[model samples]
Target chain A: LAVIKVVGIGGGGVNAVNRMIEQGLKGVEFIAINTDAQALLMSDADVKLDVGADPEVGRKAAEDAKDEIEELLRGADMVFVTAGEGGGTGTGGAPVVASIARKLGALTVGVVTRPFSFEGKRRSNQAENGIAALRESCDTLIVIPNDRLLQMGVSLMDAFRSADEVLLNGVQGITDLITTPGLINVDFADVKGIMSGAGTALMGIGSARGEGRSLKAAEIAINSPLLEASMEGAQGVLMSIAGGSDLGLFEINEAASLVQDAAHPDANIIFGTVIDDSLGDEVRVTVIAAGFD
Target chain B: LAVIKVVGIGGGGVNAVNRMIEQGLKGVEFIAINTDAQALLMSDADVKLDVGRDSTGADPEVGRKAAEDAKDEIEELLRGADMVFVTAGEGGGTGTGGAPVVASIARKLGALTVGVVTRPFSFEGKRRSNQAENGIAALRESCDTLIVIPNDRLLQMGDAAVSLMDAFRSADEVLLNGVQGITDLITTPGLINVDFADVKGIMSGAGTALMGIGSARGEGRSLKAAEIAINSPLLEASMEGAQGVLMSIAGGSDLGLFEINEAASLVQDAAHPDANIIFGTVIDDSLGDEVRVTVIAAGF
Candidate 1:
């Protein structure tokens, strides 16, 4: 069994994790690290660590509580460090937790959401600087802009809920990719091989129903706007296709050919197929293109 | 050398082609195929082929019959092209039937065919919308890729205060940008080149597609431009389920590795971690500090 842990830092991060837990995510442990006592108390995470509100105060709090953070994260194979940048606890303490997780030999993926533009220039600027810091500390950093939610034409609560959904989806998606058994199969080693020196990675997904499902799914996945990276200069790609028993070789080839066609000519591509009974007549494709020029 | 052609197969499509020509598209051959001689005469296309007597008179069967009549001429215009974009507005007479016929001819001629079509507004009545849907289904089967823009969706993009003419123009702009972006990406060589063949491969069997275009100038513009392009409300579909992405970045000489990475990073962050992303960068001196990013993202 793979030991994966999700660490939520500060008020915003803690709230996100609490939402995830309420929604029900299995096979992973949840830990909430925060400085605010009230927020920590409100969190439903399995383990809770408090550091205080001020970033400086949070840093000292983390230093004093190093043993606890380190112990909870011990033996974890992969650690996801999630926080909302611009705040004192998340901006200050996220890096500290990520560094400790890295020191313990766990692969750390940092996920942070930036503040809205109208949240004041000072906060936004601080968030930017904090993101830079987080990028340097973690192996891969994923940033989501809160301002984009406003443009989505949704209410404030829906926007935050959507953000939470995005984060959880990302986390669960990666976890499923590593743990789920597939027909062709990509093991933990394959994941480590692709991500070893790869700096910042992005994911693309697509799904389709009925005939030509694989091709449709593959096309949609390759063209998904969720992944903003260029596939042209990418050095490597890890592709996985999930379908039911009805999946065929021709379908896989059709999908893989499109993916290959979209990649840089010199890119190294590896792929896997999974026979998932739950998919019915639907096919889903997931691609991880990394190591860009 | 790759030969690219844009063929307009009806009144709406011809108007779009004329608009594109007015905006100036270098290295692309423009052709207009329509049932209306007057519309063909007004179009500034390099080649014009008129079919039937005057117009199809809001009948798709008449439009199809007209295309069948001008098959040889239409084939001649499409021959020797590596890529062809067929644009039409459905629910009307000429475009509803003629567009699919032209698209099918392009496919038979071995060209990578992309169909750009528009659906009528709900207010256009049930018959028109139904005709548009039928045309769309046929177009999807005939072309390698199809892009359907609903006239009603365009109105929703802006407030209720926007005029109908302005909404129509905005829809035209969307089509123009999509066509221009793909043409520019394929024709121009980039620092990290994604050629026409690359695009053809990804879009070969893609039944339908969505496109977004945005640009920004001055400091820290590449990523900002990319965000606008990716997050544009004009794109009604979510980026979540996309499997493939073809992106083009046009920037000035001042474009650096940092800017490129910043833009790429943002793109990747916005996408699913599992997506295949193909991107190219074109350096244009005329851009100054500006960077224009065009993304043609496809999904169900």
Candidate 2:
């Protein structure tokens, strides 16, 4: 079994991981990190850490807690750092978390969001710098722009929940892909190949019910929510498809090939399948692609 | 007036814009860009650009080259445009291959690009359906917001108007109304305005959009308009995952805040709790005793 633990930092990260626990995914451990006591009080996680909610203290707090954070991250095969950039804790501190995870020799990726244009330039500029730092600190970084939320006609109230879907889907997918007993196992080597130092990355989840589920789900997965970049030219791809025993070999072949065909011609592609009995005739597809400008 | 140009590509797309022009929309310029012989002759628009002589035998590469060959002219036609709408029917070679190129060019020129497209009915066979799927994927990157209407849904909605031609026309209606409705939101002055800046935020990179509109005259107008707009979906549009909703309510001087509140309540109920709901009330005396609600629910 791979030792997989996901760390959520700051309010955005905590809320996202909090949502993950609410979703009840089996076999993956979660850790929530934040500065605010009220946020911690409302959090759900296997482990929780409160660094302090001081105005500019996230960086200082992270430094002081360095040894304990390293202790928590050590020996993990893969570590995912989740944070919402452009804030006090996540913006200033996510890089520190990523630096620790990277140094611990764990394959690390960041699943995070930046602010909306309407959120104005101050937060936008702050998130920009925070993004730059966190990107340097992690093996790979996946950013879902909050401005993309405007496209959905989503309200401010629903904005985080909508953006969170993009982040959590990948976390859930990565965890499920590596952990679930599989028709084929996603070796840590496969993940390390696609994820480690891969730079820009994106993940999407698609599901379909009953007949023609595999193709339909695969098509949806290939079209991802953000539509920010073309998945066609990626340097690497890790695709996982899950369904019940009702999922046939051809069904698997169809979904797998559709995703594979969308990748870079010379992509280092890794594909896996999971049989979840609860899915019945339902099929779900998750695609994680990396190596883009 | 905002320089709003709606480009319709291929036979299905041209049909939509032609219908729009015939029905009329204030200050909206319609452009027909296609390879077909007769479709161009039949299209009623401010401008018509025949990129090539005949249809490309439903060949994507041929259609693609035709659009690329005339890129400068297309840009010139779209020059200084404030908003661009690329309307197409995917699965066909013309729109699948060429519409994305046009939509991309529209976006590159700094216009807020929105793609309103239709999917081939399943009966059109898997090959066509897959082509439609690929076309949409191509269009996704170029547009701020993309709304796809399934042809199959048209017939399913109106059994009373079950003819094949009507099914086709009804699909055109969805495209026409959506384009006209969105244009009105940006162009017409409102008591509470929903401007292009507001629209650009909500629809840009918003994956899939749902465009719907309804109007009721006199008696229970606010409730009736809201009810009809929310329930009577454009192209039988789906709702559950929409994270943002941009709505407009148009009424006369007699329109009340109470009525506005009531209409807003209905629209809110139709959306996910905590959805970012932006609404504006347009009070035009010409509306008399009428009330109209137009909705663009997106981000699914």
lDDT of 1 by residue, B1-300 (tens): 567889877788888888889887667888777777677777778666657653336788888877765554465346557888998878887788888888998898668899887788787789889888998999899999887766776775557888767777776666776777777777764576778778888879888777666798887798899998788655565655566777788876678878877888888888767778777777666778789887777754
lDDT of 1 at A12: 60
| Tens-place lDDT digits, model 1, residues A1-293 | 77889988865666557656866666678998865422222355888776643555566676678889999999998888877433655667787888898889887878776655654565346667777777777766665555654543254334444555666655655666566666566676666566554566566667899888889888877665545645666677767787786688888888889889988787777777866678799887877677766
Deviation in Å, model 1, residue A9 alpha carbon: 78
RMSD of every prediction: 26.2, 23.6
Over A1-293, each residue of candidate 2 has an lDDT whose tens digit, in order, gives 77888887765666567668867876777887765422222255888777742324666677778888898888888888877433556556678888999998988888767666764565345667777888999899877766755654254435534565666776877788788866767787878878899987776667898778888887877676553555787788778888886678787888778877787788888888887888777888888778752
Clashes of 1: 32
In angstroms, how far off is A78's CA in candidate 1?
84
Candidate 2 regions with alpha-carbon error over 4 angstroms: A37-39, A53-56, A149-159, A225-227, B1-300
Specify the highest-TM-score model's number: 1
